Amino acid sequence: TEDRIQHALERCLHLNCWSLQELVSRDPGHFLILLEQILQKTREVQEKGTYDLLAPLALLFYSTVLCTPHFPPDSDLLLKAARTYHRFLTWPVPYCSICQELLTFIDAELKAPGISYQRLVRAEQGLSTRSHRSSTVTVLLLNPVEVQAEFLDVADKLSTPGPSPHSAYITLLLHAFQATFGAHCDLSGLHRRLQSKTLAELEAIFTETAEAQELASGIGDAAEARQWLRTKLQAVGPGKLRTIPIPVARCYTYSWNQDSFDILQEILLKEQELLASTLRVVVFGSDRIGKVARAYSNLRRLENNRPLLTRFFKLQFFYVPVLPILADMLLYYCRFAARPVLLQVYQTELTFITGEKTTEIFIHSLELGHSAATRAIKASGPGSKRLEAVPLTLQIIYSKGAISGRSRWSNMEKLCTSVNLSKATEALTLNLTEVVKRQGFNQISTSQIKVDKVQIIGSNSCPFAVCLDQDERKILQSVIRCEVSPCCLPIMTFS
Amino acid sequence: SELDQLRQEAEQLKNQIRDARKACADATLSQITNNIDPVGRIQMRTRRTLRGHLAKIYAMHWGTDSRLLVSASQDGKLIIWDSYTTNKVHAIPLRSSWVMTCAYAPSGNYVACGGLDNICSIYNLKTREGNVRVSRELAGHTGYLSCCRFLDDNQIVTSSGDTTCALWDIETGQQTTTFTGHTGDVMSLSLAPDTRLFVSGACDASAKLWDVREGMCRQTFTGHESDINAICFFPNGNAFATGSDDATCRLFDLRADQELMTYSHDNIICGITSVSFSKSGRLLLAGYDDFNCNVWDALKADRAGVLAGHDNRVSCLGVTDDGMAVATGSWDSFLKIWN
């Protein structure tokens, strides 16, 4: 068994994770052995200095210590782990910043065992108390026409309400009590006696148990915290240890054929009836489904400027490139992934023909002119039913920047129909369709130059239609000057 | 209960209206008009061409002088032409390039226009300094301005993509009246000879007679299989014709409260963009999306002639108050006068 665990460990740090998290759960005894091995490898890194292999171990510890059915009082594994990870404070950021937040979790788990798994479960179910109330909701925004039927099945399964508040409270009480009293408790008798009890008394018992766990975690001394928690649980009240897995969290599956994230506020109406907190939006993603970032754009600024969803919830978006193994792996990722990845947003200063000014953001691209006009008519419908490109005379100053701070300037006056900006600090691939000769066909000279910063000035009598990030429905014309330079709801990545 | 009883009252009053109309449907206009001598073949010739527009022409409207005419174009310009001399009396550049309609005032002093800007910009030709100055921005519509016709120097009706029309007082810049009831974008309207009534055509494939005075819908006409793109009154003012994307025109009488005649042919497959009556009303001039502009006998319902003078869609057309000539603006960037 030990050598099996070691092989799996050495093959998962190369669906190799799910198999680890499915082999340990068999025996209550497999959760300590694995942890011991992890510490050994971790210590090697601490001795060596191989910077690249720390974060997967720091995630495996957190993941296993939170599923470990119980830690024997004799075993001093947490102290050895804390001593091993205390010496990473001398490492470069972010390693010290993953270790500080692991040490805090290892103090929460040293003082009040099972607190970090009862917090998670409580939250995810929405069965919190009247003292520390919270909630988490999962929305599966999936396109019926793009997602596979296998993913549609997994989604349907996940959505199905499996547990009830009664069963959830029974599981929470069983795991809070087991984590403390190990085998020395009777989980069969406790379950049988808890089954006959009513929902309200179960809620009161869990609220007292959670308050005791939190208070014990708040006690300075670790040694007395465990004894105080044990005494409190005894007042509230050898066998075989039992693995209590994570109950499935609340999930909702909605058919998203759209691209804008307006759907979410429609959902928020049944949120008025379904109630800081957090919302786990699991976006399922294809190649073109580009436009998802464009929708992110709105839900970033729009909300930042018209807070509607953020009023109660902290949004978090998860990208899926598109119970069964996919269900387990999905829930595990969503649960244990907690570090976002913010993508760069370019800033544009626009002076209108009227003279007003307002900074904006193009995440994906910036089109202008014949492309902008074409998109304008694509967004017309009846208009496009009732409704060549004369060039737009623009003086454009583009600056190539560098970390050295030496910007190399260049400029030219041109008479080009359109100009689109496209993405490679970052580089901005740019296209300039010149009208070498105006006429219903204008000579087209696609010029690809690598600009990072740009300055466009158009004649007040030559308004130019401007599209940001290919948003065909909101093109901006009547602009006379445009200055472009490279400038909660995060998207998330496991590493 | 209350809503199902009100729904069945709706659907009973509907068949009461259908029976009140079928009762008057004793004979058709094609029967009564069988006897009158055919109008013949309308051999028409292009008298003038109005060059200067750089892109599609979307609208035009004659002045009451039957000599001046406005035209709005995709190039963002509103040109006033002197049809007789071909000289451009005005070349007004617009603040919004997405102009879709224009309307010469009967007085000749004011002109109106509008588009996706959701504003009816009124311009004064006789300015204090003689310039082309913007008199008013009639804002308030929640959709693109689809059409408008001057009642006078100070009053103007406008239709919009908010599925409504509205009477405005140019002085206050406020919607004097709002004509709600349409369930689709109102493509067109037409003021009756008596300024107290006007009809309007919408994308709901139906037309509606409105009372300017009060602001209520008096009658609703149906029969078109597609959106109504254009509408205008029969010269007398008791009937009106509608052009639709169903490749058919239709005539509606107000007093009979139903359709009198259909103008269509198997050869014609494209939708209708515009319509106009002759001074007498005997001739209905329908613009089409096949570069043609067919002339129908309003009474015989036979295709009397065809005007093929454009390389692109015949987007808009009009007739002078004296019926002396037919103007037709088109997507080919040229208007054409006909006699």
Curated annotation (Swiss-Prot), chain B:
Phosphorylation at His-265 by NDKB contributes to G protein activation by increasing the high energetic phosphate transfer onto GDP. This is Guanine nucleotide-binding protein G(I)/G(S)/G(T) subunit beta-1. One of its GO terms (molecular function) is GTPase activity. The modification Phosphohistidine is found at H265. G proteins are composed of 3 units, alpha, beta and gamma. The heterodimer formed by GNB1 and GNG2 interacts with ARHGEF5. The heterodimer formed by GNB1 and GNG2 interacts with GRK2. Forms a complex with GNAO1 and GNG3. Interacts with ARHGEF18 and RASD2. Forms complexes with TAS2R14 and G-proteins; these complexes play a role in the perception of bitterness. Component of the TAS2R14-GNAI1 complex, consisting of TAS2R14, GNAI1, GNB1 and GNG2. Component of the TAS2R14-GNAT3 complex, consisting of TAS2R14, GNAT3, GNB1 and GNG2. One of its GO terms (biological process) is cell population proliferation. PANTHER family: GUANINE NUCLEOTIDE-BINDING PROTEIN BETA G PROTEIN BETA. It comes from Bos taurus (Bovine). The modification N-acetylserine is found at S1. Pfam families: WD40_Gbeta (PF25391). Guanine nucleotide-binding proteins (G proteins) are involved as a modulator or transducer in various transmembrane signaling systems. The beta and gamma chains are required for the GTPase activity, for replacement of GDP by GTP, and for G protein-effector interaction. Belongs to the WD repeat G protein beta family. The keyword Repeat applies. WD repeats lie at residues 45-93, 94-139, 140-180, 181-222, 223-266, 267-308, 309-339.
